[PDB]
Amino acid sequence: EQLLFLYIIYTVGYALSFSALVIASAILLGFRHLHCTRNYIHLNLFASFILRALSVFIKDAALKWMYSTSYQDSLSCRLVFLLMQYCVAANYYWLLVEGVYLYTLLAFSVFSEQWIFRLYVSIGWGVPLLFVVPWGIVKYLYEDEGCWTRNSNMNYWLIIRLPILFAIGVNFLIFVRVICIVVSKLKANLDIKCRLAKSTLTLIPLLGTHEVIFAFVMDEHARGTLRFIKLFTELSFTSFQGLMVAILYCFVNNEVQLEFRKSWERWR
Amino acid sequence: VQLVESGGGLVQPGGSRKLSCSASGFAFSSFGMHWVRQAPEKGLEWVAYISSGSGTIYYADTVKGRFTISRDDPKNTLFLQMTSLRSEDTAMYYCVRSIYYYGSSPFDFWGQGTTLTVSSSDIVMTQATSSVPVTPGESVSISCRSSKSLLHSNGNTYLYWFLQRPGQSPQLLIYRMSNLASGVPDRFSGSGSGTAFTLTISRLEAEDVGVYYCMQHLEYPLTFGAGTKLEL
Amino acid sequence: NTASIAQARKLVEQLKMEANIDRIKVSKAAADLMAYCEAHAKEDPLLTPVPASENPFRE
């Protein structure tokens, strides 16, 4: 009855979040000076969001505009459904790319930059294809439905999930190792609570680990408005991550900040 | 410096062969390379072209498909595969050096060459005349005309001059129609304007009699004139 | 201590040589440089702007 009000109130907020995120991609794109392979891992990842918020914003008309006005059960439906269900894995794998690059920088010391970056853009774009094409084959032949509906079987909607679970798990693990090494530096050195608060609360929104923060027991918060509580937590955290990766790595980054300071200096 | 072509000789029509160029004494890899042909007693013509780092091949209309050009930088040696041979290919082939940057002198060295014997649109270059009687001491003025303007929008006028002494590989003399070559005495001096060009030799003496070729480089294919013979 | 002896001797001969030179009025020097700058002021492409054809870095 009520969460619909949340959806229709945060529609414009999430569109403007998408806008702020593409704005931050543009800022990290144009300057020619913030360019560095550390930022091309970022600058694409923001697009993997731009692939999503397009969906949940411009897919909305798939349930409103076309339902504002049966033949549409041709490809023109299930192809857009695959667009959304693929941009989802594109996001959940570009978070993984960012994490694997973090570990790559902070772990090993001899590896080609352009070669490794090309390997990462592959592992970030192809792999969601390399396990959403078998979904296409199955949901085309064996249990194809109209517009490729929600979940035909227990093991046939596992197709989209299990590799996304792998990506989320690897993001969590590399996050844990990054925090282990950070605190190892910090207590091997010559008030920490602020340090680790700000640190981890910046390292989680980028790597997208919040999902595995509240993902221990399932199928038990399905009543007593607890299902809606779970919906609120998960939907808000995800629909915030798009804003938050930009807000913490494009507005509060000292390098882009001094870039803007010097740019205004250069504006007489 | 040492461009030794090899492999030529007798052939059967339509047959096949593999000409090589052992190129030594310089920075082989940094040099773009050409092949050029001369029919036993006719003028010059460019045959095939490879670039530096084997990154661009160009061919003349008469040889595309039938001719292959390749290089081996570690072995420091150029290669041409002859296939689909015709009677019009019983000629002498010259392995040619050339390097391109601002102010360079391409075609700076044409190897000795080797003969091949097989027996059964563009920018036209109007030479002066096949043969001209001349004696030492005075000044001579070899003329040349072009179908198009060789002067470019960039600023360079793209015409080269070469001199062939009897029984040896020709030599570059002038580049971009005005600039003298290395090792070439001030005696020679070319000049001109758009589609009008000349090689003027003052103080003419011995070691100067041969054929004078007026070629261009404004674009591919590369053209030539028949060649003005001078005598004693 | 003889290193300072030699250095002072050489320094003082250098001071003598540089002191016994001619020297012209800064009025003369400044007027000369100003005349040079006003003369060759229409003949340099840094101060003197040149249309965008023969500023051959343009494009």
Added chain:
Amino acid sequence: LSAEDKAAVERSKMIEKQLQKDKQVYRATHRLLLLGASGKSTIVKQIFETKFQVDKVNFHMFDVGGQRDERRKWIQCFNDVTAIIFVVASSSTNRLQEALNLFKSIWNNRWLRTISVILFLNKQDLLAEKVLAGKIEDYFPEFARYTTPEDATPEPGEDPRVTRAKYFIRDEFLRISTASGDGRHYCYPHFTCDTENIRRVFNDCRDIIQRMHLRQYELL
């Protein structure tokens, strides 16, 4: 339109690709500046230039024993050096104070503001028998109030007072370091003396690398 300048641009892009290749071979080598007062002949175990490697990581160390001793100019060169191996003796003539003010100047310089120092305090054992058989307070008075803090692991066998002297020197240098600009760079003072200090240099380089990446990521 690139009539003959097409081949020019072709050779330009070939040489530019060569620039990419040596970018690969440059961004992955560690330039470190030696700054003496040894092991440099042993640190090349694997004349001015000195190249070697640890764990397939290649180190280019420049010694500067060829200049006059006015450094305010020919040291700016090393603003992009990875680390400064600052090889200073432990037995002081007053060597410790000249070394102290040299270290302080390096730390404060506007180009070396963001360079970590690796401090090597040579000949600690030689200082040990020197100050045992017979001095320190004769040059630094504040050595009388000093005692070794409990968080300083000694080498067993020698005099806790010898360890106290060593750590007093180290504490002077780290007081320099922390007194201004801990935001960008850090001293990594070791206690040399005949082991592989190459491992110390390697581990400190890894530490500096990781710290710089964590600092651009907004973590450290």
Added chain:
Amino acid sequence: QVQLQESGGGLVQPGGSLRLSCAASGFTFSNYKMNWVRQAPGKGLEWVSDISQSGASISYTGSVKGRFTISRDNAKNTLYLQMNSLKPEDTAVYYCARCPAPFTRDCFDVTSTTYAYRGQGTQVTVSS
């Protein structure tokens, strides 16, 4: 010219007092942090004191702190060193130096007696 005159110095008995001083022309005395350096016979050089642009931040060598004091009158463009309770080992030539460049916390002054911005030096002997 960047010239630094120094004054004061002579044969004094141990434990006495002395105020050696420095008048500096050839720069804006404010902008640099000054120095006192010394050379004791048979020895190289060594740095004794430091005083910043404002003179707030100050420093000494260990063997003179509390004993010697460094002050600077930027208004008068001068640098003073008050030596007290001297010692036989304090006999040396004392040079007023200034750090190479202004507005900096950096200094490279002491050398192998090869430096450009120090005065000529006043002898100070402490003996009987």
Added chain:
Amino acid sequence: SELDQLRQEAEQLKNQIRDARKACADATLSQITNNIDPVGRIQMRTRRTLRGHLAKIYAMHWGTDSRLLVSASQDGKLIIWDSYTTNKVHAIPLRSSWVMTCAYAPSGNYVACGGLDNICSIYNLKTREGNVRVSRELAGHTGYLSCCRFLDDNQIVTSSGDTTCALWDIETGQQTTTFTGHTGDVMSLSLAPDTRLFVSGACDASAKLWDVREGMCRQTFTGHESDINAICFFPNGNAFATGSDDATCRLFDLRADQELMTYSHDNIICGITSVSFSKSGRLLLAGYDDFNCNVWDALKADRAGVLAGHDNRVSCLGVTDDGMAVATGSWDSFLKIWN
């Protein structure tokens, strides 16, 4: 102690020289140029960005053809750019990675580079064997090399960090003369247009004028507070500009043996590390150390132009022989050419 008497006539000679300079500084430059008209804030932009260097562009030098320019980076790379086609005509690896100066022979056939190995390497550009190669290893200096300039294709004048400039006969391999006399490391030498003489600025705040053949100083100037980083002779060959760690520039006029102007500003507190005039002379390109370069009206000492452009120390600067642009090579590894 006769040395005390030596210092005595030395100091009285200094007083006599300064009094004579007062008798020759009877009207300063700013007094009479005041009546002249201003210029206007020159709105110079970038025109090209040359981007191939792996490390700080530490030195640069045009060629007399006013199109090519050599540049030296301390990764060990000496590359000859063509500007118009912005192409890498050559790229040269060096015997040692630390170089503080490059030089382009006025004939165009050679380049010279040197630095912390004390040596000046001269490389043949127009060789007939293809690739470029080091023709000469001029190795007689005891400190580092900071500046090298070509007289002609055979003799080079090189200032070192041992306080000596030098003249070498490049063909011979050994030094023609040793211009000694400085007390601070020579930081920049500037050939007179007629190459009959040259200035050199050093780290003792003093600029010396020498006679290229007699091999002996002819003047010393001192109106700069701190070390001299850069020096450039006027087009006349009568004045020169010096730039120092004091964060100002000075005109030292050769005839009057003294100073004419100071180029200073309240904001600037950073040591200027490059200087050069334009071709005419009315402007002065001072490459500062707060990442900018300023364009000083040399006859007014106002600041007119500001070339910002860069994102690190601008460590070199030089105008074309025909006044067609300024190349600025900073520590961010970009050469910016400006019209």
